[PDB]
Scaffold this active site. Structure first.
Site, PDB file in Angstrom:
ATOM      1  N   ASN A 202      44.813  33.052  41.633  1.00  0.00           N
ATOM      2  CA  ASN A 202      44.344  32.313  40.463  1.00  0.00           C
ATOM      3  C   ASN A 202      45.379  32.347  39.346  1.00  0.00           C
ATOM      4  O   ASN A 202      45.718  31.311  38.763  1.00  0.00           O
ATOM      5  CB  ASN A 202      43.013  32.880  39.964  1.00  0.00           C
ATOM      6  CG  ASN A 202      41.843  32.521  40.863  1.00  0.00           C
ATOM      7  OD1 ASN A 202      41.938  32.592  42.087  1.00  0.00           O
ATOM      8  ND2 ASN A 202      40.727  32.144  40.253  1.00  0.00           N
TER       9      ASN A 202
ATOM     10  N   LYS B 176      37.302  40.809  47.035  1.00  0.00           N
ATOM     11  CA  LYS B 176      37.588  39.437  46.631  1.00  0.00           C
ATOM     12  C   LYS B 176      38.627  39.383  45.519  1.00  0.00           C
ATOM     13  O   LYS B 176      39.389  38.414  45.438  1.00  0.00           O
ATOM     14  CB  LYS B 176      36.300  38.741  46.192  1.00  0.00           C
ATOM     15  CG  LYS B 176      36.446  37.253  45.906  1.00  0.00           C
ATOM     16  CD  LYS B 176      37.094  36.528  47.069  1.00  0.00           C
ATOM     17  CE  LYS B 176      36.620  35.086  47.157  1.00  0.00           C
ATOM     18  NZ  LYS B 176      36.851  34.334  45.892  1.00  0.00           N
TER      19      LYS B 176
END
Lengths: 311, 309
Positions: A201, A193
């Site tokens: 992000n 992930k």
């Protein structure tokens, strides 16, 4: 009520999964840190491109964990920045032998919470591939995906029981209409992930962009790919070899994706503290310990730290 | 001798005025603010050298009108060097010296095919904080030294050292620090150690030099980028001075808050000098088998920002 489920931290992640489980017939109780009086009177509403409009009104909302009943599953949807004050809330809301599922991103999350969690509680991680954010108070905006990869970290279970518990959590989401997968290796799944969270992000904050312009521009696309290969290489150096062509799969799925602002983008705009410790500092230190440098990630981390300190 | 300034911007204006103020015969070519200069003259607001005004100023509207100059100072941004080639040729005397007071890498080689082989092509690396203020007003905040090097021309090795030293004497006698460099390419690499981190991060972080030095994370980032440029230079054979990173960091610490060239260019919609400052040293380092991941990432982010509305 087949299972009593407590939601510790009712943001976009906690509200979405708690509402989806509640719509499957589970008895869900929501602990509200910041949104109680709004959500309590307004309720929980879901604007979902996948599942259509859903609503939970009234909500079983609580402002203090002590008021909550003993729950079988505790879902932590809050950001990893408030995990140090999480232990007393979990212990207050946990039924005997409850399962704690951290629906949180980053690396080393479970290991940093375990010291203050009673040995009798199971600690699991859930990696959520989902596009969701908070719109109006009590409203949850679900644009895409929603799958949860579950992994077991620690607790009083042996190997057979650990697989059964992870499978049990995956069945909760699956019967709610959500895709979910039992993972054999939680730490490997957390590295997987990171390959998405670390570039998207940070670059969404740094370049003040969303996923579609970031994928449309050729230079930002190569930068994302180079950062992905750094995370893939850091994982390999720490003992976890990720799937072949994993970067291509993430890039391809993000192109098909609707224009999405990552949760760190929303955090920076709203002035909330960024999850730099779990998403950037921890994998950087792990790779450093293995003698593996992540220069672009390290520079991206330094830039985000600078931006957070600037007025 | 006779000195021409092809494009009287912040760099050309400052060095042209300083040379003219020292008694040299300087001829300024004004391309987009000729009207304001040709009346009030050229004025300098310098925290180092003070307030100077040139009046009257030998100003020209076309390079054709200029007299043949023995020295041509080029201080404009490198992106317009191709358009500048006819200007330089028209104002050049036989065997003129063309001094590119410009940053980046490979600047002279990209201009050389557009200049006659009879002209001497030199590079001038200006460690200076200067910007255009009011029309005809040059604002100089700090430093100003020029490191000169020889690139191409008909001179032999002995004549090359004389011409570089002659140009260095032009600036030094005008009250400026100036040094003759034996290797222009090495000199350009040492200037890249400042422009590559500070020009790009000022745009990327929307910051100036003082906030970038005050914050520990940005300072660590600048130093890491500096070490990449130092390593890439060494990979191509050029050993930079010892403690050069700390040297530049110390000089940047002392100097006042400065917005680099690239910051003003991005803010006013001008095209950024990415080709000379980032693309060229990246390609030069790639050919030598040396990677600059942070610089590469910085270059990619700047190109993205330039493509955004």
């Amino acid at each position: 009520k087949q299972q009593r489920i407590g939601v510790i931290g009712t943001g976009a992640i906690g509200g979405f999964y708690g509402l989806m489980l509640a719509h499957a017939g589970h008895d869900v109780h929501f602990l509200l840190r910041s949104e109680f009086e709004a959500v309590n009177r307004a309720g929980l509403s879901l604007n979902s491109a996948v599942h259509g409009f859903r609503r939970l009104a009234p909500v079983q909302a609580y402002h203090s964990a002590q008021d909550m009943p003993p729950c079988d599953w505790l879902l932590v949807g809050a950001k990893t920045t408030g995990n140090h004050e999480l232990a007393p809330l979990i212990r207050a809301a946990a039924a005997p032998g409850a399962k704690v599922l951290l629906l949180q991103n980053g690396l080393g999350v479970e290991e940093r919470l375990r010291p203050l969690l009673p040995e009798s509680l199971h600690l699991l991680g859930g990696l959520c591939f989902i596009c969701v954010h908070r719109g109006e108070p009590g409203v949850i905006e679900h644009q895409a995906y929603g799958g949860v990869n579950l992994g077991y970290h620690s607790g009083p279970a042996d190997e057979r029981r650990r697989r059964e518990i992870v499978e049990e959590g995956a069945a909760l989401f699956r019967e709610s209409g959500l895709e979910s997968t039992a993972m054999p290796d939680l730490e490997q799944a957390r590295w997987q992930k990171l390959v998405w969270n670390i570039p998207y992000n940070g670059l969404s904050v740094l370049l003040k962009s969303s996923t579609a312009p970031l994928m449309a521009n050729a230079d930002s696309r190569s930068l994302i790919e180079a950062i992905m290969e750094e995370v893939i290489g850091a994982a390999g150096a720490c003992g976890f070899i990720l799937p072949e062509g994993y970067a291509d799969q993430l890039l391809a799925a993000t192109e098909r994706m609707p224009d999405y602002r990552p949760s760190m983008y929303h955090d920076f705009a709203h002035g909330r503290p960024l999850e730099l410790a779990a998403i950037y500092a921890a994998p950087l230190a792990r790779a450093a310990a293995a003698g593996y440098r992540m220069p672009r990630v390290e520079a991206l981390h330094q830039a985000l730290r600078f931006l957070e300190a600037q007025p």
